[PDB]
Design a protein around this ligand. Structure first.
Ligand SMILES: [Cl-]
Ligand SMILES: [Cu+2]
Ligand SMILES: [Cu+2]
Ligand SMILES: [Cu+2]
Ligand SMILES: [Cu+2]
Ligand SMILES: [Cu+2]
Ligand SMILES: [Cu+2]
Ligand SMILES: [Cu+2]
Lengths: 433, 434
């Protein structure tokens, strides 16, 4: 049996940012396991020929540990992180965040996973055996070599490759014994969107029980047939695989654009060869329910538009000359109406420093509304605590954010996680007052 | 006295393409000296994390040694160059040329000079003493670190830095003894255009005697007050510097555009010359090897440079990344090319691989350009020599003559703009010899 997953490291002391990815204590892009409540002390050394900085995607830390892109260190310098892990048990990321340089550093290998473990958060699964992170990325190979050469048009729409990888393996295969499997689905692409489905060889769709998203577990498992996974989103599902052949596929949908491997076309991401009797892992009781959203006291609207050549949020974009520019000043519990233009495309928007409760999807496309599970158009992934939510053209997504006074005087980026859009400047500072 | 110039190597055996530039036999981006007629045998090793290929800018070699961008080698692989040097004595370049990746590799340090020497081509000057290459580039520094982070719009117009370097030195100073100096002006920027003038501290413009351009010497020296130098253009001038302070400046002009930290047409100092004491005088008048007379064209071929929405195009075509061997234009024999730039455009340093070009005529030039011409066909002093990279202004027509020799038929040669943002965007086509 073979299950290719990233290697493990228990805590990280020393990470080198290299052109081929993160070299943490000698291993390349390992999954860092942290216990909730523990102290993290990690030192980043820049081994690149350009600035960089590590962002702990989805972590509840102050902006010095975020780290804000203005703290990017030059080639040869170092940056010391020191913070407490207060995030719920979930699957998080660590990736570069220097402005205008993030996409290529990310695309060329600087990406790793962080797993926060809480009391009984494993649910009886074991990493690399039946707890399998599946980081789905896409690269453009030219002469069998991954290349990142976006055109001006690709810098507006996003850089899409011609082949899809799982944990850096093209046409990945998993040889497993029959049993219960916890798959941590992670979109590690620059811009590519997936509609993930698991089907039998004959075509029967295998149901997936969604148990966790970006910021931890749901209240209870939710059965899904397919789920959209936008860049930097996380979705932990449990599947029951008996002896047979299973395909993790991208099911056909409408990529509302404006390609070698069309985004909304059907193709196989990974193949599962299941043979023999393995272990059954009972799953029903989830360890910690997500907290109830707080009552917002202010409504704030956000407009996502393409202003000529520059993606904008409320007509604003990143100010490269003054990275500390305070685009939006916030305070307390706010309700954000994020509204995407019809003359736009999909935006996986992401907010640093603070998790988000998803409240409502209105004017969603038919393919999305067909997957909702409540009277507010919320997808199964919306029913958990999130930090990266996908917004479709013409769609409005309402979220609730609690800007605590504990982080006042700090800046937190709010940007689209389409790395071409972010590098292009679709990023603003959220200043906590 | 101090004159910071690139180091020398006489011929190059082994060159490594690294993220910080070319490591050739242990030195970083050295000036390679070759004798005209000699055999070059050099091996390129890719030490990057992405494909690349070395282009011998302005060399008359077959497309395997050019090398055509389709021959880019992957990380770890090697490429052997082997050719005879048949180019006239001049100042040439070697820089990356993989499609879509050239601008950043170039910008981040992969650029060097090649000097071809013929009989008496030194004119009595000595490299690093009074024969000084001035490679003028510009970089955007953020926190004292050069970065290449173009926005979508910057990939349309070109990546302009906020500081100008001479041989990789910011606010470069040259401490020289008074005498004759041969300055080899080379534009090593990705997109920035310069109008170069040498002025005294009081403001007096020091005349420059142009002696050579891209493809070798002129018929005779030409005195100039200022000259435009577009990316990858070369202009060798001779100046007489007495004791005093001189400034190599960018003179104000209209950058016909459509970050503004350092406006392209604004005035600023590129290098400072502190001249003190008496050095050597070098008499210069008889220039070796006269440029050949242009051959008579038998076909006229028109080229339109336009911005088709988001894609810069040459005759409405752009580079086909899916088929790098795509034959955009098929040529044969001696052709006269009418390269016409749109009014709704910007400056294009146009460049053709494999074959030199005779400049024949400039019409509809802007006033600032027409004021510098030296003949009744609007030709600038730099047009009066054999070229391989010619600047074309919006609304201007430049007619050139190219002799598509029978020696290279069955081969492909790129024809692209040397604005590296424009080239990366796809402003490049294959010229197929029949
Ligand atoms: Cl609209
Ligand atoms: Cu992220
Ligand atoms: Cu976006
Ligand atoms: Cu971010
Ligand atoms: Cu060149
Ligand atoms: Cu060339
Ligand atoms: Cu151009
Ligand atoms: Cu070229």
């Amino acid at each position: 049996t073979s299950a290719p997953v990233p290697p493990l490291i228990k805590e990280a002391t020393y990470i080198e940012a290299t052109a081929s990815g993160y070299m943490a204590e000698g291993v390349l892009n390992p999954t860092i396991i942290l216990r909730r409540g523990q102290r993290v002390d990690m030192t980043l050394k820049n081994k690149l020929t350009e600035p960089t900085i590590v962002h702990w995607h989805g972590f509840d830390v102050n902006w010095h540990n975020d780290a804000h892109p203005s703290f990017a260190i030059t080639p040869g310098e170092s940056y010391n992180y020191s913070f407490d892990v207060v995030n719920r048990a979930g699957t998080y990321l660590y990736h570069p965040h220097p402005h205008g340089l993030t996409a290529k550093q990310f695309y060329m290998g600087q990406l790793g996973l962080v797993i926060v473990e809480d009391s009984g958060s494993d649910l009886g699964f074991k990493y690399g055996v039946n707890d399998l992170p599946l980081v789905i990325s896409d690269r453009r190979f030219i002469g069998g070599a991954p290349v990142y050469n976006p055109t001006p048009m690709e810098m507006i729409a996003g850089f899409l490759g011609n082949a899809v990888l799982v944990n850096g393996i093209k046409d990945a295969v998993f040889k497993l014994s029959g049993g219960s499997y916890r798959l941590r689905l992670v979109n590690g692409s620059n811009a590519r969107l997936y509609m993930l489905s698991i089907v039998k060889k004959n075509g029967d769709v295998v149901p997936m029980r969604l148990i966790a998203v970006d910021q931890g577990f749901l209240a209870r498992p939710i059965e899904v047939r397919a789920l959209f996974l936008a860049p930097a989103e996380r979705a932990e599902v449990v599947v029951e695989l008996g002896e047979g052949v299973y395909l993790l596929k991208n099911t056909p949908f409408d990529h509302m654009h404006l390609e070698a491997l069309p985004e909304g076309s059907e193709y196989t991401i990974a193949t599962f060869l299941v043979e023999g009797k393995g272990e059954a892992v009972p799953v029903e009781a989830l360890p910690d329910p997500p907290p109830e959203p707080p009552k917002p006291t202010r409504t704030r609207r956000f407009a996502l538009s393409l202003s000529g050549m520059q993606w904008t949020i409320n007509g604003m974009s990143w100010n490269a000359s003054n990275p500390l520019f305070e685009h939006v000043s916030v305070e307390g519990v706010e309700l954000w109406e994020i509204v995407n233009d019809k003359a736009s495309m999909t935006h996986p928007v992401h907010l640093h420093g603070f998790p988000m409760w998803i409240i409502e999807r209105k004017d969603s496309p038919r393919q999305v509304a067909e997957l909702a599970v409540d009277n507010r158009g919320r997808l199964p992934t919306d029913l958990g605590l999130k930090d990266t939510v996908l917004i479709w053209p013409g769609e409005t997504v309402k979220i609730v954010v609690n800007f605590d006074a504990k982080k006042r005087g700090q800046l937190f980026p709010f940007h689209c996680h389409n790395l071409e859009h972010e590098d292009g400047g679709m990023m603003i500072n959220i200043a906590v007052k």
